[PDB]
Every structure is written in structure tokens, then in C-alpha cells.
Amino acid sequence: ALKTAVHEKIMNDVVLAVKKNAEWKVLIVDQLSMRMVSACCKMHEIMSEGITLVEDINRRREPLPLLEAVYLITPTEESVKCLMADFQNPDNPQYRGAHIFFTEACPEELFKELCKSTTARFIKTLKEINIAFLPYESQIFSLDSPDTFQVYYNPSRAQGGIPNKERCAEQIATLCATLGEYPSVRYRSDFDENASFAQLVQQKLDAYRADDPTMGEGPQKDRSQLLILDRGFDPISPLLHELTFQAMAYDLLPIENDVYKYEVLLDEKDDLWVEMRHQHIAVVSQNVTKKLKQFADEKRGIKDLSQMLKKMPQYQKELSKYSTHLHLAEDCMKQYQQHVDKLCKVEQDLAMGTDADGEKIRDHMRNIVPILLDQKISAYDKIRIILLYIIHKGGISEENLAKLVQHAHIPAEEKWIINDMQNLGVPIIQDGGRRKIPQPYHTHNRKERQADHTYQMSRWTPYMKDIMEAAVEDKLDTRHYPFLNGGGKSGPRLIIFVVGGISYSEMRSAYEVTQTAKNNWEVILGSTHILTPEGLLRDLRKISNP
Known about the structure:
PDB class: endocytosis/exocytosis
Organism: Doryteuthis pealeii (Longfin inshore squid)
Keywords: parallel beta-sheets, left-hand turn connection, helical bundle, endocytosis-exocytosis complex
Strand order of the largest sheet: 2-1-3-4-5
Keywords: Protein transport, Transport
Assembly: monomeric
CATH class of the largest domain: Alpha Beta
Helix content: 40-55%
Number of domains: 4
Strand content: 5-15%
């Protein structure tokens, strides 16, 4: 749904918009744009429409004066510099012409320098397409901006951080503009900084609405809502070792930049991935092979292995899909059985507050310490349950934090990762002498849910989902999620943005709430960056240790 909207700006407003004939052309992109393009477009889709080669605007390349170049770059000092460079002087046109498409609004200073550039005579197309976000999935977007976390949660970063927060606001609008959405802005009152941010986003959209009246045109697009959240709105979820496929693989395995080696890329273009990603491991291997069985049975007591041997090298390209997913499920279980099982049971008690039987837990340490003193258990794993523990207790004393940092043997460098969580608004240091911090995300403060969990280690429901279901039914408390304005082939759309990242369990809830809690509503979830338990810990790291 979102994923295609981009596909269309790329294909119709760039690749096809420039094609006036059969002449070869060159696609010159930059680091971000390329990513953005990869997500929504198949390579051949573009390569069979006149583009015969893709270059990197940066690392200079061979001059082709006979072909026109199409520039899909982010309007920066660099990029715009290389651009004017390629045409830095006539009789040396790096290319025969130029079709320039800025991913987002170009700064008028460089814009000026360019319009007066030695490049002016070559520009055959000059547009701003406004696409400053990665369509990570058809329901999830990312502004690949992990540094914003620092701006929000590190004090020193307070000011000077304003242009970073103002850039985000504008990117969020590029995403709305792209869906032709002019939503109503809502934010979480309890974290004062949100308001200012909610305002930023608002302005930025106004510019788009003023520069195009049909934005948010009729089709229930007058009910859409863009709810702004701060990461401290649910510190439990992004810490838990989740067990649904995607969330669990990224957590326990080394899938860098979305590539799982033995190598493959976990993308929506996979098709099978899109069917297993949210499933619970327990049944993944089971169902992938059940799905393999229905593939082969479409060509291929005595069993005949002939057809297999026959028509097999013919499908190696497809039978490979299943292969890797079986290796993925394997890897997840190998890791689980090793040490994770034991970690989940403690985490679930802590996150829930109640045990498997629905009983309020007690005698915490009895289970915590045995983990902490296990020298074979990781440092980050220990940190995770210590925060969960504190979060549950609603704050601890300097004294006890001291006792846990000891039993776990955490380098006093990784020790501040705890203390810093406090900057997101989570209560970790008891008294504080200040006022009591509300913890909305605790089960005893959230609507009741049925105590039948089909799995004991998967009882926790992201507080995110509660927000989603309440909003989609218009039962989202304005006392905590006010409108900055007060009151408040279609949508309505619930655009939720979290400054501070999002977990796979939340991305999983966006689909859940959508593929059911319907009313025609479609829930789109976006964030500054995509989280991972350890990764969040790292983000927490850089505050008291840039």
C-alpha cells in the first residue's frame, strides 16, 4: 500500500517521465536514494526502460557524453557539488544532458549556485520528488536517523539539535504527502518534548497542504491521524527477546543491513518471508516445509524420486527460498535452546508482573541472580533483565543497582546504559526526591487481555497495540494523546511515528491491528530508526558515552 506509492513516484515521475524515446540513459544516485529505490523497485523494472547502468554520484565514473543522465540524489553539499562537477565545464560534459530529481527540498543556496552553474545549459528536467524516508515494509517506514535518539535523550544535545528535529518533521511530511494524507496531529502529553515536535511536523505539513489543496482529499482522509510517540512510552517491548520469526532472528542472529549469510537478503520481495516474518518460531520450520511440500507437489507403499532428480536443477532458484528459511529457523532455535529459553521466562514474569498462572510474582532475585552469576551469559542480556526488573519495581535505590551491577560483573562503561534509560522518562533510581513517574505500559494499567497465551514465553503484548486498537476505534484518550489543535481506495490511516526507534514486535502489531481490527483503517508505523534489543542498549550507550 505504502510501498507502491513510492514505486509510482519513481516509475512514473522519474524513469518514465524522462523517456521521450529509445535512447540509453544513466541513473546517477546517492547512498540514501538508492536504498529508497531498491525497496520499491525491481532492478529490471528500471533497466528495461532506458536505464542501462547505475552509478554512484560520489565515487566518480566514466564520462558518457552521448547519453543523458538521470539524477536521483539527496540535495546535499556533496551531491550537488558532484553534479555541477560532472558538467563543471563544456566540451567535457560528463554526460550529454541532465534530468535532475531531488529526493527532498533542495536548499536554495545550492539551488542558486546550481542555477547559475556551468551546468545550467544542460538541465533538461529539474524537480523535487519529496521522498525522505525508507519504505522498510508496506506498513513500516524509517527515516534512518539514529542520531535523533541522542538529540532527544542526551541533555547536552538539547539545542543545536533543533535542525535535526526540524528535518525529521519535514521527512514525516514527505511520507504523508506521498500518501496524499493531511492527518490530524496527536502526541503523548506526558513527555513535554513531544508537543514541540508535534508542532514541527504540523507546520511542515501545512506547507504541503498550502502548496496543494487536494492533500487529504475526501476518501475518509479527514479522519486520518498521525500520533507522535516518544520511545520512553514503552521501555518493556523494545527490550524483550521476542519469539515471532523476524523479531527473533534480528535479535539473536547477526543480520547486518538486512542480509543473512548462510548469503541472502530479508526483503518483502522475498514473498515467502512475507508469510513467515510474523509467525511464531514454534511453527515456522513446520509450516515452511509444509509449504515446500505444496510447491513440489506441483510437478516435483513405494516412493518414486525420479521426477525430483529430473526437474530439480530447473528450480534450484526457487527451492533455495525454502532452504534458507529452514536455515533461519534453525539458527533461531540453535540460539534459543543454548541460553534464551531460560531468559524468556524471567523476562515474561518481569514484563507481565504476573506469572504463567496469572499470579502476581514475588521472590524476584530467586530467579534473577542465577542468571546474573552465570559467567557464560552475555553482558547485554543481563542488562536487559536488570532494566526490566527495575522498570517492574518502578525504580530502585542507588544501593541495589549497585548490588546488581556487581553480581553481573558489568564494565562500569556498560553500567551507565541502565542509569541513562532514565532520560527517556523511565523510573530507575527510586526516590529521586522528585515526583512519581507514570508507567502506562504496565499490564495492570492497561486494558485487560485474556490470560490464555498459546505459548508460555510469549505472553507480552506491546503497549503499542493497545494504542493502535484504541485509536482505530476512536477510544484513544485525549487526556494523554491530545490533538495539538484540540477536539478531533481509502483509509482512514493511523500514522504512528516514534522518535527513538521501533521494535519488530511493534512493526508486527501494526499489521496485526490492520489485518483485523478493521473499520477500513490502515495502520502505518514509522520511526527515526529500526530498533533491536541490543541496538537500543547501544543507543542508550551513547548518551553517557558518545
